[model samples]
Target: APPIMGSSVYITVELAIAVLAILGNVLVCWAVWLNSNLQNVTNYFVVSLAAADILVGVLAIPFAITISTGFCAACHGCLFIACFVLVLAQSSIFSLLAIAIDRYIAIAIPLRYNGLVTGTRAAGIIAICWVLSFAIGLTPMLGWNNCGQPKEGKAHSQGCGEGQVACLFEDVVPMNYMVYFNFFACVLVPLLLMLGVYLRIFAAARRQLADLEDNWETLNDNLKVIEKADNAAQVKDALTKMRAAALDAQKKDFRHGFDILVGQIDDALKLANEGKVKEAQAAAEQLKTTRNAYIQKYLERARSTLQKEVHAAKSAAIIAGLFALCWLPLHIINCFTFFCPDCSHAPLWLMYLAIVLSHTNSVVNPFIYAYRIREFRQTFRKIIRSHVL
Candidate 1:
């Protein structure tokens, strides 16, 4: 057999990826902890995915290098290492699917998305992701592997472990399991489902973006109307109008905050009517800050909510795109091997490329969090550099 790439080359790349994966995901989770704004339903699942990637860097990648570089005399070593690689990798996929489902609910059923995927429900799904991953990932170890077949002297007789004394993935793991159960049932189905959900999400996103253009423009014009008044006469006219509206509301209900704001405007109108433009402008400036603070704190129907919704939609879409790019080649290679077991297929270098490509998915997530999403990036900067957003 000829080697196209050096073992050191592979080992060095994996080492760097592992280090980057560890620090990046840790920063993501830490950013979530720091930024209360980042602590939302979608971000809960994001952290779950980060957790899976972190373990990949910490536990799985080390095991990966171990399996790649050395032969395990003990068969359990191979099974254990490969099982974790399967478990954590599947957990990553499951977390991504969970995020897609949440994103779909958010866009398709905006009214129900909040109640449907509450924090507790997100926590529950995160648990299920790992539990299901383990159940599927460990199937090979639970008597489904390419160990000695039936009718062998179980305690006394062994097959490859006895004869070759080396643990290889092709030898210890069964092809039928990879073809039927692992690829088709687990990875392929979920990937297809995510694709379907993402399509509808983008469709809904387009409609949402189109419908939103007018609302923000209306709000912008309202702000300009309030601030465009310059002369004392203009300020007096504006104050009278504001006072009438406030008085009308007060006559109807007389809210506490309204009483204070209206009273402030009453004093401003007196200043302007007395021909004191300086004091009037200063008073209006203070009131502008008050109004700005008022809306900032107590907005129920504003554009900020919708903008953040679109932000999450775009963030998850990028995540889905990167996930597919990083992992699909590996699955396709698996499918190619499954379709024709006897004929020539991918060579050794191709398998290594696929293996490295699959691992890169975990590495890209932290970068996505920092680059695509604003809050996550700000939080990350604050955590690492003490920078303020």
Candidate 2:
């Protein structure tokens, strides 16, 4: 079959995204596994998220190429390809949600977070995510497809030639089932859960900061008491020595806290680059908790400046907010157009715009880390210098 007039452009864009998603996700996984600081309970989920994104690049994009270029000759092969893409994409979404829930618990209930979100439990959660994703993706292919005679075909049905198991909605699977069940279960439900979880995380963060402010006030009061002891020379000398030791302890705690905070932010950005935006946002909010905690203890005692403590958190918020903005429109369209059987769709241009915007989400995701995460930038520089430069 001959190619379309502008097929080259479309193929080029698809291949470009394929390569980027593949490379970016691979780097994310590698960086996490290699860096000891990133080998935390939370990063176990981040690694799984990266694995899902890698599947997007490896399985989904190649299948898209077959659609564009007539690459896969077998009908069953295309069916399997489509199913694989669906499974991987769905898994990625659920993984993102899982990370969000994990972060919420870790931040909202720090005292019990360790016991609740263990490595074994996280592993089980990821395993369940993939299993459910597979089950949903396979539903249509396993006899609920267009082979049962539909009134008409949808977008996924456009590419079949002959002998292909056109994986479109079948007569058995009512249109409402396909639309509502798929959209609501896959998109809307997870979205609502993530929204609720993130809101709780934000509230917890505010409470933590308020507590820090109170502690800072208490520390100032203690300092005043120590200063008043200056009336007795011996008492003043002993109090001064004790204060110096206390200050030293605070400085050590501050340094250690700063390192841990940096590591958390770096991994949070790692998760975002892997397409886990909610997790990244949660981790960033958690970073704010760490930042404020350290500041309360050491702000007046530690000698180092702590002006830009919120930078990492702000960057993380941007990643999450931008991702939500990018994907929300498509979800709404899926619910409205696909779910409503009686309603005819809008003009084709609107559909095209939604698609373009959806792809834009992936394009922008990797770049967010390229500019925002300090470790990412440094590591990228080292790679360029060693190889390209």
Candidate 3:
């Protein structure tokens, strides 16, 4: 087969992602292993997910290249290769699901989470996750596959014949299973289920914080609008009130300078009373210079803090958002391929994009721990520092 540019590009991209995921997830595992504080229950699930990602980087991608690029006649070998993608994918999502449940238990019922969500329990759950992955992954072999009848002649459906069988992804894997079982039942449902659990965890956490509802209610009463109230009769001062609240954005240097300047104003007043009126004239000028000097440092540091927080929020969103965005297009394509005949000549480029997007999930996942956790980053830096030395 001639080396196609797109195929080679895709292979190059996957290999890069594979290497990155392997190194990143490896660091994640080592960081937790060496760092005693990080040896908690949540990280156990995290390590499990990382291991799946590691396997994705290690096995699935390379197999994906050789097995499904164009043709592979050995039917079960192709299925086994494809099944690793499924098994590792299931492993990742289930681990993430377990993490969400673990968080819910931790936040909603803190005491029992500690008592029940022990290392042993976590290990058991992780084992079950892998088991379920294999069960679902192997379902294709148990006849939910395209090779049962073996009548088609196209490359997409060469089927498990006596001769060389062409094994494209859709050729071997069931579209119904991809659409209904994997997409809707497994991926979509679990994604949303995990999301709601996080939301529930947040609600419980807000209750613990104890002021969220009160704060919102006060705003509602003040606004006198419905949550989406159509009452035009209600006062419109609330938006203005919110603006005022925001305008009072506190700055450390402003307060610091304000305190210092005000005290000097009293000193200037004392000087004025002592009849040192000439010296007092320059006192305000001296205070003005003093204010700028002190205020400058505070504002700069304040800006740094604000920027740090914004970066943190971006990092958080990237991990959570990509889990939705990258995987979604592939499943959406799965639906299209299964249901819509008129829109049927599935643009090969789009399919490649979806496949690349799905694999890209593991590529970005390790950085979640990398960017989010200081401990992980610190250990990461330490390892780099030692290597460089």
Candidate 4:
């Protein structure tokens, strides 16, 4: 019989996962709650994800693993654990999908994102995710189970032991039916949708960067041409005025001989043009300085905005990748178990490793947020420093 409470490597691993999952999720929830900057509509989904992940450590694992496998505690005890896990798992998946959608909109249509995903609307989406999770979780307990009574003096085949009450559980449903439904509804659909959304985000980012570069290049070229034309016209008008001034001075006999007079007029005109040129050059220099400053500022702002968005994209992508990496194996194993129950080559430790890996996803997300998000990192540093001091 499986030990109800043991000091084996399996139990140790489970305990470690539970502890880390709880602490990580709690920190994430705290960061979101304490940091006003993190109070954006997209972060609402993040908060929900943290809460669901928290429960993986809080409600799901302990009840399932702590209880004795052979001990018939009550009717549907195992089913209760199953339902609890199903709800939290579904919620986490849905929350991640919502985040992917949020990122897609933000990156793809930044101007429209705020209008599309407002605070109230975000709350409503989270509510819907939880409600759907709850609804699906209840199906097994509410007559979709596999519990049954054993024959006279015989042990129960599934669910609670002999003489104990039976409830509809996972085994009651046909393997094929459960596999198809669960695979598509819970796993495949959300994963596929997120992948599609990320693809669009990549395309949108490239298009946006290309457009910005083209626009900036065009504007720079146009500004240079305009400055050149304006400088030429101003200098030409100033030179003409200086020529007239020199002629008037010479007419007053300021210089007498033809050669001498020509020399005087030439000197006067040269000085006048130099003065006008100095003023024009100064004005042009100031204008150029202002133009360059504004352009630099605009470019810096745009770069910062794009960098932050890219950082968020990286974080979300990691989450999607981790979700797939950690959970896909388990689901594949589930498929194998359903299709070929007699397959003996599958190692027992592989199942345990899969479960451990899945829980580790919850443990890793808070660190990702801290690493990827600047605001969160700052806030985390402050929190840590305060505690340390």
Better of 2 and 3 by lDDT: 3
TM-score of 1: 0.71
TM-score-superior candidate, 1 or 2 = 1
Full-model lDDT for every candidate: 0.73, 0.57, 0.68, 0.67
Query: On a 0 to 100 scale, what is the lDDT of residue 137 in model 2?
Result: 73
Of 3 and 4, the candidate ahead on lDDT is 3
Every model: Cα RMSD to truth = 9.1, 14.2, 12.3, 12.9
Candidate 3 backbone clash number: 0
Better of 1 and 4 by lDDT: 1
lDDT of 3 at 182: 83
Model 2, runs deviating above 4 Å: 1-3, 68-79, 112-116, 150-178, 218-323, 339-353
User: What C-alpha lDDT, on a 0 to 100 scale, does residue 315 get in candidate 3?
Assistant: 47
Off by over 4 Å in 1: 1-5, 149-165, 208-307, 387-389
Give the per-residue lDDT of model 1 (tens digit) for 62-168.
88777665363456557777678889878878888888888888767876777787999888888988898999999998888765642224323334345333555
Off by over 4 Å in 4: 1-7, 73-75, 148-174, 221-291
- Which number leads on lDDT? 1
lDDT-superior candidate, 1 or 3 = 1
Instruction: Write down the RMSD of candidate 4 (Cα, Å).
Output: 12.9
| Ten contiguous residues with the weakest lDDT in model 3 | 226-235
Considering only N, C-alpha and C atoms within 3 Å, which residue pairs clash in candidate 3?
none
TM-score versus the correct structure, for each prediction: 0.71, 0.65, 0.70, 0.75
- Residue-level lDDT of model 4, residues 92-150, one tens digit each, is 88888888889888887777988898999989989998999887765666766555532
